[PDB]
């Protein structure tokens, strides 16, 4: 189900804006300002994916989450608790969650071309070439 | 003490943020292009709020809240589990939170005064300012 | 005498600005923010009047009133002194002050016409095509 | 035929540029403003996908329908002869005609598909996609 | 009678919006960007026409058309069935139509000083201010 | 009371707006865009004071003014019969009545300080800034 | 006839664009700042005035003048020979010419009006508005 | 292969930014501002093509080429060797051009959408979108 | 003389603004927008030269022309009398008279040289820049 | 005395901009650009504060530093004598000032309260959040 | 040497930097703004000359002056210690600075010259026009 | 010979175009975003100078190099094979470049110069002011 799999990325996007917020107040080296700059225009792109999930859901005829309660329940991402971070690591954490939003948005996609849902199927992949171009990226700034 | 009233207010910020969207989203009414556009302005200000609380926090020496996780435990807003609601519903929900915000801003100012904390003064007393031109405009919405 | 015209219209147009203000702080209803924007484009246009019609009788040769004292003695335009308005009572108040700018205008631009005033008519002529688009479209509010 | 699709899409394009202009023109209610500021927004949108549906026509190698007879003539769009309305007609009259709209944009993606035209399906998906987000929020205004 | 000429005015607009999308789409030659883009400007100019006549309509208690079927029953200009044209071509049929809106207008003026309507002449003499510098231009184009 | 302070800085606002409009319209000498121009930005600053003390005073849960009669008796503004000034008789002029304003916005900011009123205090402090800024420079031109 | 007093306007504006230019340059002063600024934008307006006529007179079937020659020939302004000015010289002599032109234009209006050319009309008393409003302007500059 | 197509057309595209370049330096006649312009518009899009051609290949985990050596083995546009060029000529290369182009992108979605691609399908389809609209206007440069 | 070459230049200048205007308004030919456009910047140009060489003079203690009547005296640009053209003539004419002022520019740098004047050489290199540039594309409208 | 304190920090200021020139001219390291640039402005900020601080005093009936060599002669800054920089020396260095002048605008704002100077202390907690939300910053720099 | 000319320039652009703030603070008389705006935007000029002075410097392989210090020791330019100017006094001041600039770009001109350094050449010739264009105005504010 | 100059500049400058996209690509570390910025500002500067010089060319008369071809037999530029650097290695090899370009433009300017050719020599020295200013920049990053 197409609604299964964009209420679980809503509670990501939500979570994932929380997350970024942490590595922008918390980085620490000579680096500062490039992650902090980053890390705000991440956080806005999450904002961004959170409102147009949910009226994508509510565009379905379903009820989006409306809780962070919903969102820590539904959520895959796991919160990031340590308060202090080099560039590195930020990059990494980063990675890692776009990683797996990627894999849900190949998901979603496939959901939507079965189900016949050809909106959905437009906003996956362009979400998709968004993610794949940022992995792509943030892998070069660990090598 | 000033951090710990921050801390709080630095959860309800993030609370209102979803809460602000579900009305966004749930509103019902050939009133639905006003309160869509209106709501999308609250929690973009909150968004904001959320920021600039906790980067005071880092300013004063201390943790900001990093999780959605800590959000709910520290908020004194209850959320919002409904969706769906007409204009008037929405406008009282929010003057109720904006009252709340605005208590809390109010000890917020007088606190950092009795520690000496200028800046933290200046910042509630802005945005004192903000809750109560909208406390004005919000009960006249109700009249 | 085309200045007699313009300097009661001067004297009106202040005093709208004022009204327009009261209609402006003191609407009523979920209705409160689009009335409340519109006042404002109202009384911006009638601050503009105000200058326009004192820098006319200038141009003519003439002194334009310079103190609200003359403005209350010149109006024609009755002063609202209820505090508390619905959107409904608000359109109907502006419309009934338009009919009579329309109608001075009208007469404005016939004065001037036999005067040999060009200039004159074709800023009476031009209000005159404001008045009559609002009116239509505040007529259009009431019914 | 993709082609078949298109042309009597260009109709319903035209024939709902000058149906919005009614509502556009004759909405009453204290609620005109915001009727009269979205029914222009949505007239401008028609006199856009008719011209993109016609050069889209044109791309394809046939020859796009140049005249108000013939948009008559293939148009399924039935035009409205009241020139009088509240909100809530205007609302409900445009959902139905989206309806249509979307139900005959979801025949052009799948048609073209089928005959292996990308350019179209693209253009239909996205056209899609704005009819879906307007269908719902059209919805939210009637409950 | 103003609101005769109006309504007739109104029809060809439209019309002639329908007329130009024709040149617009189906111009040859090496000439092709120059006429493509002028059109574009001439369809919306007449897209502001109809909605402007529409309006005025309106504004003197009447009721604009509202129906292409209206549009086609009123109109004084001949559709255009060709669908393939050279630059040349298209400056003569659009010479050919504001010479005929010139003469309408020309009598619009003339008709609503008569009845005393100060606002429609303003209106009808910048149209003819328009279509007097585009006339003069249109013919130096095919000399 | 800080509403009684907050409402004879309402009338005197609107009474300065009448009076600078007097000084822009009657400037004499080769000076005369410079003041024109200057004159013009500081009427439009006290129609922003006027509005914003309104706004204030009905946050405050009070009855802004609204009637140029109520301005009158409120007034600690002499009103200017002159009708023509040269450029230091302008500058003369305003600054009287600036540093007159000087005095009532310092006391404002007391007697809200005693109320506890931070909004207000905050309010008072920033208009404070822009009269002393704006008094030296007027002590300037006529030095 | 209207041509002919076109085409000694047109001869006007472009000696005048030459004259204000010398004003622009030979300005002497602590002064020279304003009056090198606001002869720049009467200048700009002159070269504006000369390019209106001449295709106003080309829209009359008419040409242009098209040679400096010509405009001197057909200039009712006597061109300044001097090199150095105060600004109270300068607006004398603009005012001066600014009165010429608006009682060619004031002709202008009238003349066109006999003959039913009420386009010419039109840019006529807009031309007149401008002078008049300027002339006004100027005399303060000098009392 | 994906890989393959996309490497090919990142080869295409440099040397097509060259070719039309040469377009842009030689074009001759009345027309050259037209084609000059239009050549500038077009080589733009080509260097936008390059990179975005190279980024896709290097997020697929390949390397893009790198040198005008491996651009020239590479690619599948002759280079044009003439120096002076008619409208009418260089309007013939380019739609040349764009027809291989076209079918190499139709290649590309269909080889993406085998393979699972759906970034490089999206990517695909859009710039088939670009060249189907731009070859339509091509061709009819050429009648 | 430095002086003795901008004095020249500068009446060309004045000469080539009308005579421009000329080639603006009198342009025939399907080709006319493209003409009527670039006339018009290239007039603008000149009116710009115009200015700037004044200064110059001015700048180097000198009266610059002040008159139309010196312009034609010291120009060596031959008046257009003609007020009919095809694209063709008017870029033949432009290129002679851009051809001269080249000549002119090259002298003017020359001379400066000489005389140590760093300032005007750089003032002609920079025009000098501007008018091969024209020149080249003025020659290839012609072949 | 807020004048003893303003004027100190008015050296500071003028000192500080040349100081963090240095830094930026001299920054050395792959992090150039971003010195380079963060350098840029906060020289840009000390030339504000210079006029802002100056300005103050002169409101306040004083006489701001108007030389350099009264700069030097009250500065607290020592001057930087070192003409190269890795980023970690430069934010180490504006550290170190950024913390000397914060404790100098709490004595300002100290001071000037007591005073009774709402102004200066409304421009003292300004800057104090300026500076505090930089110290936070730099601190996250050099971890 | 090129570095010697530019090392004291980079010193005066300083010292001229804090003069001009001293004329911009202190100006008396009606014509306060004109000279405020203006002195504004001439100290505005120094810093930018100041910092593209040490950057040239630098780029030729030396170090530019990085304190106060220096600054005082190496201009040629005295420290104005009055803080009370009318506009006369003010541009007679910048005038003789100006004019000593001057004389050191001509200098600077020469000086690179005949080492071969085209790029200081330029640099100087392009100040060098800047200053004579408002030592020409400012000779004329004073005459 | 100036155009022997060009035209290798003119192959060096496509050749950088693509070098730098191999940068602007292939760089690795958590500097990804500054030199994957910077680079792109590089490379857009050389397809301008690749432009400029082939227009200069042509400008001189002769024909622009308008193949890859020609652009690799006349290059002085070594191509880059690899695909991965570093920050460090990408601004060496940007440097080592740029230090081949200054020395060419440095001939170019000389060159011109004896052939009397003012236009070309303004145009080198101005690319030179450019290298060397990035020279200096880039040297820094490398310290």
Redesign the interface.
């Known amino acids: 189900k197409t609604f299964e799999i964009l209420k679980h990325l809503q509670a990501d996007a939500?979570?994932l804006f929380?997350?970024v917020?942490?590595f922008?107040?918390?980085?620490?080296?000579?680096?500062?300002?490039?992650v902090?700059k980053?890390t705000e225009e991440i956080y806005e792109g999450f904002?961004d994916m959170?409102?147009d999930l949910?009226?994508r859901i509510?565009?379905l005829g379903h009820?989006?989450l409306?809780?962070?309660?919903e969102?820590?329940k539904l959520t895959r991402v796991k919160?990031?608790?340590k308060?202090?971070f080099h560039?590195?690591d930020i990059?990494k954490e980063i990675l890692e969650d776009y990683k797996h939003l990627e894999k849900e948005f190949?998901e979603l996609?496939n959901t939507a071309e079965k189900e016949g849902d050809?909106?959905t199927?437009?906003?996956?992949?362009?979400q998709?070439?968004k993610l794949?171009?940022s992995?792509?990226?943030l892998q070069?700034?660990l090598?």
Do not use: R
Not at 121 to 126: E, H, I, R, W
């Open positions: 939500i979570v929380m997350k917020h942490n922008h107040w918390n980085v620490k080296g000579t680096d500062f300002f490039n902090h980053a904002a959170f409102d949910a009226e509510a565009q009820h989006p409306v809780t962070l309660s969102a820590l919160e990031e608790t308060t202090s560039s590195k990059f190949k996609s050809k909106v199927v437009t906003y996956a992949d362009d998709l070439a794949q171009k992995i792509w990226m070069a700034h090598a």
